[PDB]
Amino acid sequence: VTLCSPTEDDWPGMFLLAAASFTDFIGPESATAWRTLVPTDGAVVVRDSEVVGMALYMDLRLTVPGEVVLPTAGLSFVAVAPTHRRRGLLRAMCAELHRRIADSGYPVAALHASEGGIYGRFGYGPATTLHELTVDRRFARFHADAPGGSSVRLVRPTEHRGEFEAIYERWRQQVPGGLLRPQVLWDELLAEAKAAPGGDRESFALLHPDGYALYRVDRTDLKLARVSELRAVTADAHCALWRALIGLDSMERISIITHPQDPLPHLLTDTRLARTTWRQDGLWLRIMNVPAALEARGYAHEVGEFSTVLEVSDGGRFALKIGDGRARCTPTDAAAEIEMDRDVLGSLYLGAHRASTLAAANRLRTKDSQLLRRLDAAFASDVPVQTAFEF
Amino acid sequence: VTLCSPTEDDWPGMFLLAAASFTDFIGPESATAWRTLVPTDGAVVVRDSEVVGMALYMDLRLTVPGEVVLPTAGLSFVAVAPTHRRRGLLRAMCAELHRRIADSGYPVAALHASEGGIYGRFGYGPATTLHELTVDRRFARFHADAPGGSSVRLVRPTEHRGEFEAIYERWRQQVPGGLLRPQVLWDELLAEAKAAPGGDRESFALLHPDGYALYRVDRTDLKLARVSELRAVTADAHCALWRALIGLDSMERISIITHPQDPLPHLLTDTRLARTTWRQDGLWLRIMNVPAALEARGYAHEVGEFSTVLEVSDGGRFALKIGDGRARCTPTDAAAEIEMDRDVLGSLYLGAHRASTLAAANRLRTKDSQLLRRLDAAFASDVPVQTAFEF
Amino acid sequence: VTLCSPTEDDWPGMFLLAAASFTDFIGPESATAWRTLVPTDGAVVVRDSEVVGMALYMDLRLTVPGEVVLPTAGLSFVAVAPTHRRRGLLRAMCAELHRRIADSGYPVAALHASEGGIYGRFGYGPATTLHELTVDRRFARFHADAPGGSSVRLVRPTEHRGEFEAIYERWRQQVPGGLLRPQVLWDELLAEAKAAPGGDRESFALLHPDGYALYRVDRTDLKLARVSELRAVTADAHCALWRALIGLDSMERISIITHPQDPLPHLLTDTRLARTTWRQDGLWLRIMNVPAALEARGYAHEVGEFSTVLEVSDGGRFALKIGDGRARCTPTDAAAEIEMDRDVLGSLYLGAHRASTLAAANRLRTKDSQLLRRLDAAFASDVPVQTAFEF
């Protein structure tokens, strides 16, 4: 059992482990596009010889509150062979990649979790929330106040790549949770827009100057349209796209994976028709450098200047001063007024979870309720946190 | 077709309409307890003779942000005979009760809606959100940080009426959404705690000095425990009660109807085990007197003093100044900076919906994004808004 | 193994066999009302001692085409103990009751079949067709042509017994399939209109001068209303009752067991909303005396006078002359032009099945296609055949 950066000779063994571990992993061509985002020394393997564990990170750009873009290490392709469970391989691979990520200068790492109970203990906190809305479009009527009461076109996705790329780039720079989507991932997205024999139906696009929706009819439920992606930069675009989707007269239901502040339900005379059918953690964050992360993000201007001492368990103790939408985080040995594990800070960081909610579970400990109200307000995001794309 | 306050002679016809309209309405004894909350002149009927429509309000006490208690008219028992649909009976009954409620001095009216598309047009906005959590208790493990790692007792509800009454009274005065629960409604709750032949199983209670949970095994799914009510005044009580519920070793699943900020998921090593299985509007609010309602509630101290001009459609135009957690609302003919229908104000009022979410659906119109951020912050509640009991 | 008319001493053994054979049979009081319709010598039992088989008939009045009412022997309470199958007990009981029925002067016998494959071989043919319609009332809109665009009242069934009795009496005399419903069966119907603990919900009535509907919410599906009985004497009544049922705004679906010519679907702008969810044989008929039955019923006036020779297998050969809506059936030894088993004649008799459909299955044999067209036309009923009540 040894832990190494893989050589080219290791990749067939990594693709066998991948196929056996991930039901979405078709075969080696599955990985080509994503591999271009893995830096030199971004991957570790464990050999017993054969490959019994693997983990890597990709170079990403994540938008955080204040429209600040952070270099982010996206952990992905993590697998332990079913023959090698409970032998400390995940712990060993995560410790080595975290050493490399921190030494390389990334202030944050991120991942999407296969189960909820694994990554907390490695300092990742869930930072975005996925909300599935299912609309019974047969009853849906737009409110008299709704915008746009056509600027939308029904198009073939492959013929409008340029326009999708440009709208997404505007959206990802404005919204916390936004990720830069490189060219190779647009290649993969547009390849999945094709019908497959025995697989997905063809995807169609609704295109507005300031938004798009990509949707396909369900494989088996022919009265359900699933919107894979909806990116809108303006309220007018968001409403115009939903008017077009509610015009899919052959469907009974339209489902989308969105965020908890999606305004859709308020566009309709009956808010109850936009039903929440599923909710789950989206992106998880591990803050790698506490002061660099806290200083980088913008904070709410509504809260007056305040100072506190924050201790992150095994993460340092810092004097935190927040004023004029900005934070100064400096080392101190003064008594801590707030204490939390690293994972909790990652949950607070994009505004998805309130400090006072975490305090009520004792995940965040303070004796000052005023300080809690001030952190709740300051860490809030003006623009609601969304989830970009899974990795 | 005439609209009158009912005489005693009208009540058998009202109970026939009730039985035919409401599947929960067993018979006349169904109504006795609730009728004691209906004031003189709190009820209207439409006769064609026989009873073809009815509506009433009850005298309630609703807690709003800042622990302020408002007299509230609770609309209930609203029904139109299936023989008399689309003849303007609902409009006529709602206009007459709203006249009586406003003339009597209530600043707010409230209801629970049978469907989402009816009450918006009468100025009611959804003001609380019901979130059903279903926990797979076989996997649930408490986080190392969770409190209480027994102060809880398994008891017969009927033997501890005094202690439930006293805990609920503390909870309803502290939480926005809280309602005073009068003696007659405790009589009805404890009567429903009994097993019924062909109906519900017996209810049990978990009792802590500072909280209680009332739960029963599902009629048909014998591995599901449904928690009808959980009221906890402290974090320690909330965690101790959930430790006891996760100790129902004969169950697979525990379900509760709670609110979106319930800290339960953060108590567990796997936050995903507390699954959101259902979400719906809870209490709806109609603001009857705009300035009296806005002046009564407390506002967030974190936001600096600011002034604006708010226009409610057909509700008056007012100069609104919010500072030091308090608001002054006075009549003005100055140009409006914010405009919204009455229903939108009711949705904002307890902090359940953000002004910026309503603005993105064009339900709230302003040309100032700074003003929107300030209203979002000021209307926020420090204590998350919960739903008391249905009526 | 002996076959006898039961003594009073036999009835406890008959009620044990009944309880074990029929899931609807609660206990001895189940039978009291129905027993008053069983004549002296209307029942047979087989003893092995204990009761191992039973069968009886009731005295009924059946309406046939031309508004003619026939004395009818209604076979019911037929059971063989599970210990005594395949020993010829059913054959022995049916042969003895048929001897008694024919000797007593009944021209027809009738029954409702527990399975489709038993009674054909004893000369019963299915003569009515049950069609279940399920309406998604949320979408239902009445056509501009539909009548009545309120004469209907929502009432308690027990308070309007007189009016239901009088409407049903008019309906049963006008419609083929109609049965006289005696006082004891009204007592039983109105007793089933009560809610039962663990059983059915309370029944309500919609009452028009010229029709009624009795309906109840489903035990388990609380968004389904089941109409147990709808009797309307005029088109206006039928349409007015359906307007009231489509006004059950708390339901998603309304289901009724009706007949194939129910005009309901044509009342709606979308005929497809009245969905056929179930179809089955209703009343079965055994013609006991061929000439008396054929002479009694009226025939279509549109068909010109014609003569043929009909042979019923083991039922006699007759010269049949049909003209001016009337038939003369007289014995002959002349060559048969039409041949069929007794069961086929029972299927033709109320107009539910076409002679040309039975001919295409070779159940009716003729070499004359003109004769087939003439029988199809003559045996047709102007008023569509309905099913009264099960027995």
Next chain:
Amino acid sequence: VTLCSPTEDDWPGMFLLAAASFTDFIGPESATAWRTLVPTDGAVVVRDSEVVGMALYMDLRLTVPGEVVLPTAGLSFVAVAPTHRRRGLLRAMCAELHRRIADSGYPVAALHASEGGIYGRFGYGPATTLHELTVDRRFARFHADAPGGSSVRLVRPTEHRGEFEAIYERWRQQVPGGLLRPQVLWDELLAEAKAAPGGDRESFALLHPDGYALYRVDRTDLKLARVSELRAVTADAHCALWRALIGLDSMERISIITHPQDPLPHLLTDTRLARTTWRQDGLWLRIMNVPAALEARGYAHEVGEFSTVLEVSDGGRFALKIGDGRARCTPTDAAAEIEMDRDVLGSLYLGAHRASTLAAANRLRTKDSQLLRRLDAAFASDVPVQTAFEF
């Protein structure tokens, strides 16, 4: 927004709209065969540029009662972009095609409806009824009277194209509802008889000199055989084919979409085993020229000569005389004795719906019940109306 006959340049935009509107539409090759049936000027498009609406008709030959074949315009490929709903595009396209169809000389138009509530208002009435029968073949036993108690062969459909073509041609000329099936549609049918990866299983044929059945095992339910098409010219063929289908000993169930007078249930000792699992409108008809349509069809000989005055709403008033199986329809200003919308006449026209059923819904208005009986009898079809193939 302009309405034009499409140029070749319009067809890619029409195929995009088709793919987005119709789940069965695979791609451009989907349309080749069907396009050969569209005449010059048989298609309209709406451009906004891009294609936002389309509609066309095909040249068909429809059999009506009396074995008369009418030129029929088959409306198909009707779609409005989801971006352009509720703007009058369907009304505009239907008005233009109806002008072209009427000017070209077609006496009737026909379609298959995607929903039941759209085409009535454009004068189409449902004229055939689809009845799905599902047989539990494990219990099915043929009656002693059933024919053929082997002339049937199990064959590969592609090897017997000539024999299927010749049997179908005999069937379509004899049955009302029959359509000429041109060579290109046989090419498409036999191409769908092939297995597809991820799609349908291989089709097999049962072939008799005087009938055929094409059947395939269900994709997912491997104990269900679905009969796509059964065409039999004689009773012997129909019975022999069902004997072979009931010999599919590896199946539990055989399902077919047939018509309400299918004699199958009468072939079995238990008629209940042929269960009605689904019922729906099949072909819809718009009578374009009232007198030409009424004069063309044959009428029942059993009804004596009679005369009336029929008014079709916005369709003309005519003196109708029916005798000796023939009708004379001539213009008159005499008072109408019968009145109905154009759609109602289309529902009556092939004999699928009775005049007296439509009268009971007030869709057909007369003060003469004798006249109603005479129309019911005269419009009846001797050969039951069937549905040929969808388009």
